[PDB]
Design a binder for these strands. Structure first.
Length: 206
DNA sequence: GCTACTATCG
DNA sequence: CGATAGGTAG
């Protein structure tokens, strides 16, 4: 793990110079995923973050945990179904999201969601095909779940708006790059594209 | 002080 | 189409 990061960092330092320079300035990767979280939880967290900064997302989850739980633990599927969308909406979840998070909890209850062990065996493509069946869960949301919950190392969220902005100046492009362009420009980062994206994400912090 | 900053549905 | 979640950097 922290060993994967050593290897990852060395690899990004063996590509072209700009990558080597970014690693040195930003320093050690501090990305901390949470694979212990059950599928329905990581998915709800990813859904919540849609269109929202980490800070906003976190204040919303903080409330969700404080209200819909006792020991400020992440609400269980049953606790989630026992809450109405109006109440969920008061936590900061959009009305649409409140409905989707509701379906997700119900699905976890009825074992309609792939189990963790089964998710652990799915390639990203299979994972994409599987979870995309869930309302409110698509490419962006599934990459975020793969990165922050699952801890996969070769995930390049080329479709992330912020990453594209950071990619634009990192690669000195004339205009914000399309998704496919970010895809091939970061090809050399394999098999640690997650770490590559993390580093591009730290650029504002400089 | 003010604003800009995913995926779905009538 | 065109609303829609909110903390906070600029």
């Amino acid at each position: 793990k922290d060993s994967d990061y050593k290897r990852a960092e060395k690899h990004l330092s063996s590509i072209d110079n700009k990558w080597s320079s970014l690693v040195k300035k930003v320093g050690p990767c501090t990305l901390t995923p949470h694979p212990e979280h059950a599928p329905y939880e990581g998915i709800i967290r990813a859904i919540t973050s849609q269109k929202l900064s980490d800070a906003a997302t976190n204040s919303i989850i903080n409330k969700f945990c404080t209200q819909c739980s006792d020991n400020d633990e992440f609400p269980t599927p049953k606790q989630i179904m026992e809450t109405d969308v109006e109440t969920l909406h008061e936590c900061g979840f959009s009305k649409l999201k409140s409905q989707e998070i509701h379906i997700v909890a119900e699905a976890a209850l009825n074992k309609q969601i792939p189990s963790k062990s089964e998710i652990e065996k799915m390639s990203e493509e299979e994972l994409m095909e599987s979870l995309s069946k869930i309302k409110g869960v698509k490419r962006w949301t599934i990459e975020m779940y793969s990165i922050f919950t699952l801890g996969r190392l070769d995930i390049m969220p080329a479709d992330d708006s912020t990453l594209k902005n950071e990619a634009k100046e990192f690669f000195g492009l004339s205009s914000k790059p399309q998704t496919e362009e970010v895809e091939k420009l970061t090809k050399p980062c394999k098999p640690y594209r997650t770490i590559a994206a993390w580093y591009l994400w730290q650029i504002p912090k400089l």
